[PDB]
């Protein structure tokens, strides 16, 4: 598809907003531990690793239908171009809480250890599903069958197997520990991610309504929404909550998006 | 309301200043532990979680009345105060530089005591109306004190985004930080700025200077517009946790200073 | 006082340099522990908290006298020295790179000893008058030593902001840092810069170079203006805590160098 | 060779993409622990230090063949491919977000297991010939496996800079990172970028995005020139250490992606 | 000396490169522990702190002779080499990525050993004369090895700033870092750059690239001017501490490379 100039004039710009709730494993809003994974079930050995589905954080994704733009026989057509995005992880302050049931910081007179450890933050804005690459810590892990993971895993999948590809086309089904953004593709999506590992690492997060991210590429072109559909994807693992018993649950937070779009001329394919 | 151009000429600018004391739990200037929470009381179980009001840090809010601008509300165009920029500062930072305070020893009984440390939260906002808030909690089965403003009729959904859990920050020392946070879906007429570092024992990090200004104009060059000539300042500045010798623990907060520059903005009379 | 333009010409610029020694508690050059506080004496209880003067770090402050500018004090306009920029350095940083000093072993008795670490506080200021202070303390029941300048008749309000608790940094080694901080509601005529990192055992981090200048001009392009041709330089550089083998502890401070560039500013006579 | 101007016009630009798999020690894709080292085997003494080849992470290198540019090597000028910019990404970062893997418990046997952490090393390079390396080791009495490429006949001088200990990164998975580092006295025709964080148990930190480009041009506007139409891509990405339940330890590495943009550069025919 | 304009024309620029090996205490290339200090010997008491010379890291320094510039030294103006920019690199950073070296186990005897960590100190300078130094120590009652250069007649004042405690870095591996640091009140003709992170066990952080240049020109656009056609390069790069199985400890350092670009600068002849 040959991309042409930006369409000017009145009504050329639009704005959408949305939020994606986290998918840490308890993914139904009636779940007692909604926003958390179930207690981590640890592998007995390399050969015997069977994580429960509810213990595995997955990517969130939503598809937004935009206003129809196009006569599909005219020489040029228009597409929605995502220009910029304001995005924020919501409910950061809920972590500022030392009375929750948990493990004591010192003895039984102290507060409880707050959520900490490994964090993973990612958002993407694209005109189609985020393209994914498969890679696991262990090729001998047996994943739950109703989740989307790598078929016919071999040791190569502990590194880069160019056959292990997928599209993020379902909310709450693609394990973060299996899939990551494919940098060899995603020509039509901008994605942004940061990771800090560790068992007990302090989480660090910002929040403001003053920051915007521009989505335009080196040529001045943002993601173009095929079939007038905008794709928002995210994961926001903000750490691990430990219970008194010492069992542990991933903690995630929801993400807000506010995307500005304009109208972009393309040559009819 | 349609926003027009900046009003130029003499006396088009004004400047205000204010401080906000922290609301950590002991919120009365006579309280022995003013500027701290009461000893954290830990939930016995998920089902039975009743934090005392005095153990829950809340937001600080102050409303500042600005000079009256409009003589005749029938004119085609009207003026509003526009917040353009703020200098802001957490005060008393060096009060944490203190190893003789009562507490838990760093090593044995010959050493100094462990200074304030652990989870920190800093936020300020400047707005032309109350900061709009979104409700979200660590646990939906916590029972909050009824003399505070918390999410009505909580369900497990409230551990994530429930779009019906919305509030306004309209009272000082009443809205707990562990329940409410700024709503990025609204707040078109406020600017907020926040940072969080967690952990049980993390060292606090803070800066102080009179050389730094934050500009409040949005992408259209328009700052917050003060509805009814009212400027809303909001803040929380939790600088960590102090541990007592008994190992009981208290949140510590510090005051925040504001210096806001404002200018007159023409609007189209909405009636 | 109405500020006018900068004065041009030859000899319109001057430059001064000075150093300020740390005031950690042992403030006399002949003290065995000069540059350190005395062993921290801890409160038995909140109501029983009597920190020795020698255990409390205080601000350093120097007044530099500048060439007189107005031989005739009745002219319709007067000149003032305007502080334009400063290069400043915390000296002797590498003295901390030392694992043999008497103290607490890192591991067992075969290993090096724990270096200076924990809470750091760095501040400098340059003004044409004394730094303006706001008092605020961790505990309003602490009894401070009388030979120091602290908040008069403390009440619980002083654990937060009491607008009556103000002071001027006008004496070297007398204003404790745990009591006073720079007052952001004043200090129109001073530039100050601070950085704090807490913790019991935090690694300190410091840089040193002669390539970096801080510009002191405000948003109207005006620096601090030196009243009575006097320049005020203030500082504190607490670089951490040294722990002794007995587990007693001392604050460790380092000196600060200032190199200040000043120009002649015109002002209308009041 | 004398470097002239950039050749303009249609078809003057190309781009290539490639990925490099990590060489942590288990370097054969059929290895059960591919993408990890074997269990680290520790020296019994300084004199007795024989690390297994499979426990030693090595540099990854690939050579990308570029389209032949010159139809007649007799002309006064010829064309070379010039690497202008690169997008590069460490893939599978999120595979580390895994608390269920067999290993050492964070707390007791009810908790998750400790994830990969400790020393990290990341490096990428784009050049028009092999990366030039300098040898330097932690201990000169270590006996390295003979089928790896290491320093010949080491002496204690090799625990610092011996100007004779030089090599070319011209083999994949053969040059140990603990023996070789990029040589800053050479590599005129390569650009390299590296970052290291040590420590026994440090949390790893990594970013990923498709919005970031690195420009490869030097201060004269010239990027790496590809000799014999070959582009050399080199990397190492050690993300830390995995600890087993037995407390044995394995290095963990991740693959790296490269997307390089090149253009045609005119040179004078030697 | 009055400095005039830059001299143009061909052949007005030159480049040099050099490397400085670390002087950590074992400073002879045939020393078994070259590139390390000897096991730290700790003070028994403040009054008897007698550190062995081989335990004490010192500054590296090299002088580079540049091409001679003035035939006739009776001309009203002369040329000096002016250092304009430097590319510098700490070499061998990846040798630290090594967990099989004899040492202290991370966990038990099945695990790797703890790598180099703790206090780091990085400094480089480029100047047209010796680096000017200021003296300051942790304790004036330490007795330093006589064959090193330290502060003569130390008194307690030397635990802070004594304006008489001055030296020049004119000898390689003789001036202890724990005694001497760059004197910011002098060094008008040298650019130095330093960073320090303390602590016992701190993870070291280091970057390496060939893409970064530091410009050495001052505020008036003048770099270091080379007196008698001599260029002085100085450095220390302590990357932390290696711990042995026994728990004895040794400082670890790495070499530094320099690539400096020089141009010809006109000066007025002082006759
Ligand atoms: Ca591709
Ligand atoms: Ca909205
Ligand atoms: Ca004021
Ligand atoms: Ca060379
Ligand atoms: Ca001087």
From TrEMBL, chains C, D:
Protein's UniProt name: Capsid protein VP1
Subunit structure: Homomultimer; disulfide-linked. The virus capsid is composed of 72 icosahedral units, each one composed of five disulfide-linked copies of VP1. Interacts with minor capsid proteins VP2 and VP3.
Principal place of residence: host cell
Residues of the full protein shown: 34 to 303 of 371
Source superkingdom: Viruses
Compartments in which it is found: Host nucleus; Virion
Function statement: Forms an icosahedral capsid with a T=7 symmetry.
Entry binding sites for Ca(2+): 17, 185, 188
Organism annotation: Human polyomavirus 9
Alphabetical keyword list: Calcium, Capsid protein, Disulfide bond, Host nucleus, Host-virus interaction, Late protein, Metal-binding, Phosphoprotein, T=7 icosahedral capsid protein, Viral attachment to host cell, Viral penetration into host cytoplasm, Virion, Virus endocytosis by host, Virus entry into host cell
Gene Ontology BP terms: endocytosis involved in viral entry into host cell; virion attachment to host cell
GO function terms (MF aspect): metal ion binding; structural molecule activity
Keyword Ion transport carried by entry: no
Family to which this protein belongs: Belongs to the polyomaviruses coat protein VP1 family.
Listed GO CC annotations: host cell nucleus; T=7 icosahedral viral capsid
């Amino acid at each position: 598809v040959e991309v042409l100039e930006v369409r000017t004039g009145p009504d050329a710009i639009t704005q959408i907003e949305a939020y994606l709730n986290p998918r840490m494993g308890n993914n139904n809003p009636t779940d007692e531990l909604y926003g958390y994974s179930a207690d981590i079930n640890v592998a007995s050995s390399k050969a015997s690793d069977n994580p429960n589905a509810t213990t595995l954080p997955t990517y969130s994704v939503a598809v937004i239908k935009l206003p129809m733009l196009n006569d599909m026989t005219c020489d040029t057509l228009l597409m929605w171009e995502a220009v910029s995005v304001k995005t924020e992880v919501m409910g950061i302050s809920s972590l500022v809480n030392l009375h929750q049931g948990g493990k004591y910081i010192y003895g039984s007179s102290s507060g409880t250890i707050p959520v900490q450890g490994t964090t993973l933050h990612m958002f993407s804005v694209g005109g189609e599903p985020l393209e994914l690459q498969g890679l696991v810590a262990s090729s001998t892990t047996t994943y739950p069958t109703d989740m989307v993971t790598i078929k016919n895993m071999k040791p190569v999948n502990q590194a880069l197997d160019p056959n292990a590809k997928a599209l993020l086309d379902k909310d709450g089904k693609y394990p973060v520990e299996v899939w990551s953004p494919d940098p060899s593709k995603n020509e039509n999506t901008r994605y942004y991610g940061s990771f800090t590992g560790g068992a007990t690492t302090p989480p660090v997060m910002q929040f403001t309504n003053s920051v915007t991210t521009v989505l335009l590429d080196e040529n001045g072109v943002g993601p173009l929404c095929k079939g007038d559909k905008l794709f928002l994807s995210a994961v926001d693992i903000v750490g691990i909550h430990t219970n008194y018993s010492e069992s542990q649950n991933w903690r995630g937070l929801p993400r807000y998006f506010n995307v500005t779009l304009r109208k972009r001329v393309v040559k009819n394919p």
